[PDB]
Amino acid sequence: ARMAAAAAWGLSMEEYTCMIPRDTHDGAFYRALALHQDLFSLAQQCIDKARDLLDAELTAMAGESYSRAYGAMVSCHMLSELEEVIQYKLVPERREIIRQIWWERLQGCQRIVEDWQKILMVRSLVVSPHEDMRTWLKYASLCGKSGRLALAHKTLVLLLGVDPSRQLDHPLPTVHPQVTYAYMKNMWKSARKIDAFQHMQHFVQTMQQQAQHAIATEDQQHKQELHKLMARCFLKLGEWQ
Amino acid sequence: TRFYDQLNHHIFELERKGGILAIASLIGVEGGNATRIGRFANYLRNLLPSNDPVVMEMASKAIGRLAMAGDTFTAEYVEFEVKRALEWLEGRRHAAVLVLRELAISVPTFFFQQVQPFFDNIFVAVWDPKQAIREGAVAALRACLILTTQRWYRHTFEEAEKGFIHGALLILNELVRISSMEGERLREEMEEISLIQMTILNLLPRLAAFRPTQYLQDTMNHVLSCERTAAFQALGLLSVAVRSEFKVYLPRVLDIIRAALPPKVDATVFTCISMLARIQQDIKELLEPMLAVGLSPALTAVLYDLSRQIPQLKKDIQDGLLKMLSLVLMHDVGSITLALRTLGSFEFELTQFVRHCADHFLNSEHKEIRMEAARTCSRLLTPSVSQTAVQVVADVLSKLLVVGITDPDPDIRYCVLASLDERFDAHLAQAENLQALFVALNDQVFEIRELAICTVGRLSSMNPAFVMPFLRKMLIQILTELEHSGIGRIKEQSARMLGHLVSNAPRLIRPYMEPILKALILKLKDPNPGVINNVLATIGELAQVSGLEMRKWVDELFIIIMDMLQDSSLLAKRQVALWTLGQLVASTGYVVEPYRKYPTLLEVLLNFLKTEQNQGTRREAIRVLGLLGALDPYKHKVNIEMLVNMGNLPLDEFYPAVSMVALMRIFRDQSLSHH
After folding, report:
1. Which residues contact B531 (CB under 8 A, 6 or more apart)?
2. How many other CB atoms sit within 10 Å of the CB of residue B646?
3. Of A90, B207, B255, B331, whose CB has the highest number of CB atoms within 10 Å?
4. What is the DSSP string of B504-521?
5. Distance between B386 CA and the closest CA of chain A, angstroms
């Protein structure tokens, strides 16, 4: 039931995890379920089992010059993330410390969309998509077409709370500027070049208006970043025109 | 090894039980084979023939333990000895019977193919007037049978009944047991909790399953004919194996066993009643003579196993044991330790009793008892709660601690300090114990401090008045003494104190970590695994305590640990370095680029996976490998003649060329010394 369980881990599960062979990394990994049931006294056992069951695979690829071994290193990464979830919940001060480190870890991995999806799958146990926004914006931006020219839209809609493909002609929402900007860039890289241009023009007008309400020693950094964004939008308006 | 090699000779020439029993816990434990096989075997080959059970049973285990080695000498032993003990199964002799039982199984790839020749050899061997062979050697046929289940009985069964009481009986039992894996798994389950008498009894648990019942109806008649007094285990064993109406025979069995129930065949008798619960009313009745036994390790253990087999009668059994054991305890020091051990370990519903025996034990010179009693008294104190019990626990454990300070013998010292169990906190936290521990902490002998600090550390969360400033002093003074006093072997003991002085006293460690790590890392740099292993573990925990606050010292510490790890091929307890690096990086949040700044780390971790055989060490290496973010193979790479000659020249010239190259390759090596 490896594929049935794989489907279950996205957006049943309790039954699917009992039809997976135990003599493999994936069995212990997708019962370490234990981190989804908060069974830490079980998850610790499942993680140690996953480490022992993974084991030989690291030694098997020691003659492909560790090229294919990368996949096992990804499993090793993911296994630490399982422990990270335990520490995340058990020791609150680690939760913010982990945010630094996980991000630093993510930047060192390959840019394969599937590996990022697996990391995000486990990451969702501890961190909302609306907190590590840098990861989801980069995820959408990993490739001009991501892993399929549909995921960038779903991700941006998730971060927006607005679905412009159904809410047709809706104005650009009062959301974090990077999500709107990425959306407009995604519209440009399609047939809808004119719409992207006009939206960029109104986005710039909106930012110019918003800049006038962030003039203080408490929030001038926002205005400064908004100016950087204005510069990016103006260059895009130039090239698009 | 020579010392034990010669002793093995004299031990087998042989009191005798003591020698063979003690050596049995070196045989197969030390792991040596150059002598354990190669000359020891001559002692077994010539000395074993005259050796009664149970001592010979231990020798039998030694036989199997030699076969397990599997080396050249082993192979010579296995064939030489079994081939002689196929014919000697010839009444001189008797050890040959047990050789077959174990040796045949130790190397099954050979013995599997000789099922019937062994039967023929028994057919002849049993003729000896002694009749020892007729019982033992025939029963030993399990050795030539059971291997068939790993890949004859369908006809040998009839041959056993027709061609072979003794013969047919002894062959029949094993031929039935081998019909399934269950025939022996049932016994393996049981052992979690004249020979023909025992075998006729053993037929009933197995003929019931082969052919379900005339066999059972006649088998019990044969039991009664072999006069009637017997260790009637048949119905218990059957009431596990099937329960094939075993009760129908009890009206002619229960009236025979019962007289033997008092401690006064007698080796079991208890086991002939227990298992029939699986007549609970009759076992309940009959516990009285069973619970009247004296303080023997065997009968007490049997009664405990009885309780485990029949939980619903446990209270009646345990109340008996409670009284039985307590009376001896209240009443000497050579037997009280069993009373105390089982009173503390068993599920009983036991305070002043310990104070009394403790006062007796403290004034005895029997060092074996001083060692056993210290930890055993600690076991019994478990249930404790009136103020009297509080004073009893604190007083007894304090007095054992005083022995742990004033007694020159390090083994008694160990036992009495080890006795200060975690379960007795809030009692050991009293001044009566902590003041004695204070004396231990400043004692002239470092072994006392080494043991005593762990207890003091634990107790730091309960009574800082007699812990905390002492731990502060010892951390500073011991870390100083490791260098300033010129300490030799004792330095390792002092190193052990470090970590013991840290793990359980966090209120000291945070503000002191700076002077500790600066000097502790200095000790890491000072030179000895006896020191470094403890320094490494302590630093690891210190990193866990401070987390990211000590990032400024990570480069120094990391480099030192890594260098220690790289030499793990010689310093083979440095799995510790793997753990320490793992916890250090995880705790501090060190930037995940040690594979760029110190690239060897990853090569080392991979070498561990394909060097070390210990699953734990490999698991830790995996944990460290996954601690850092998965590395893009590109960035990884960035951070880092026979055929060749053959086609370029005629063969007439090629031949000398490759000959000369091979010779010069050898000639440039140091191994040339031999060639």
Report:
1. B482, B491, B492, B495, B523
2. 12
3. B207
4. T-HHHHHHHHHHHHHHHH
5. 36
Token pair in block for residue B611: 């060097």
Give chain B positions within 8 Å (CB) of A110: 630, 632-633
Q: B258: which 2 tokens?
A: 């019962």
CB contact under 8 A, A55 and B626: no
Entry field: residues in chain B: 675
Q: Which residues of A touch B547 (CB under 8 A)?
A: 93, 97
Q: Which two three-digit tokens encode residue B546?
A: 């401070």
Q: What resolution (Å)?
A: 3.4
Measured between beta carbons, the chain A residues lying within 8 angstroms of B622 are 51, 54-55, 58, 76, 79
Three-class DSSP labels, B534-563: HHHHHHHHHHHHHHHHHHHHHHHHHHHHHH
**CA distance to B142, B159, B204, per residue, from B223 (Å):** 21, 22, 10
Q: Which residues contact B483 (CB under 8 A, 6 or more apart)?
A: B522, B523, B526
- B258: number of Cβ within 10 Å: 16
Q: Method used for this model?
A: cryo-EM
Q: Which of B548, B591, B633 sits opposite A70 (nearest CB)?
A: B633
* CB contact at 8 A, B163 and B127: no
CA distance B456 to B434: 8
Whether B302 and B324 have beta carbons less than 8 Å apart is answered as no
CA distance A74 to chain B (A): 6
- CA–centroid distance for A97 within its chain: 18
Q: Which two tokens stand for residue B24?
A: 């049995």
Best of B601, B628, B638 to disrupt the A interface (most A CBs within 10 Å) is B628
Q: How many residues does chain A have?
A: 241
Eight-class DSSP state of B384: -
Instruction: Write the residue in B591, B622, B636 that is nearest to A54 by C-beta.
Output: B622
What is the C-alpha to C-alpha distance for residues B26 and B49, in angstroms, rounded to an integer?
22
DSSP secondary structure, B47-83, as one string:
HTTS--TTHHHHHHHHHHHHHTT-SHHHHHHHHHHHH
- Output the CA torsion sign for A12, A18, A19, A21: positive
Contact (CB<8Å) A79/B633: no
Cis bond before residue B665 (omega within 30° of 0): no
Structure tokens at B668: 């440039």
Asked whether A179 and A160 are in contact (CB, 8 A), the reply is: yes
First CA to last CA across chain A, in angstroms? 53
Between B591, B610, B635, which is nearest A59 by CB?
A: B610
Residues of B within an 8 Å Cβ radius of A: 547-548, 589, 591-593, 606, 609-610, 615, 618-619, 622-623, 625-633, 635-636
Q: Which residues of A touch B592 (CB under 8 A)?
A: 101, 104-105, 108
Breaks in chain A after residues (C–N exceeding 2.5 Å) = 11, 32
User: Are the Cβ atoms of B633 and A105 closer than 8 angstroms?
Assistant: no
Name which of B524, B540, B438, B454 is nearest B482 in CA terms. Answer: B524
- For residue A79, give the nearest of B548, B626, B633 by CB distance: B626
Q: For residue B36, what are its two tokens?
A: 């354990």
**Are B589 and A108 an interchain contact pair (Cβ–Cβ within 8 Å)?**
no
Helix (H, G, I), strand (E, B) or coil at B173: helix
Taking Cα atoms as reference points, which of B408, B411, B465, B407 lies closest to residue B433?
A: B465
Max CA separation in chain B (angstroms): 102
Chain B residues in contact with A67 by the CB 8 A cut-off are 633
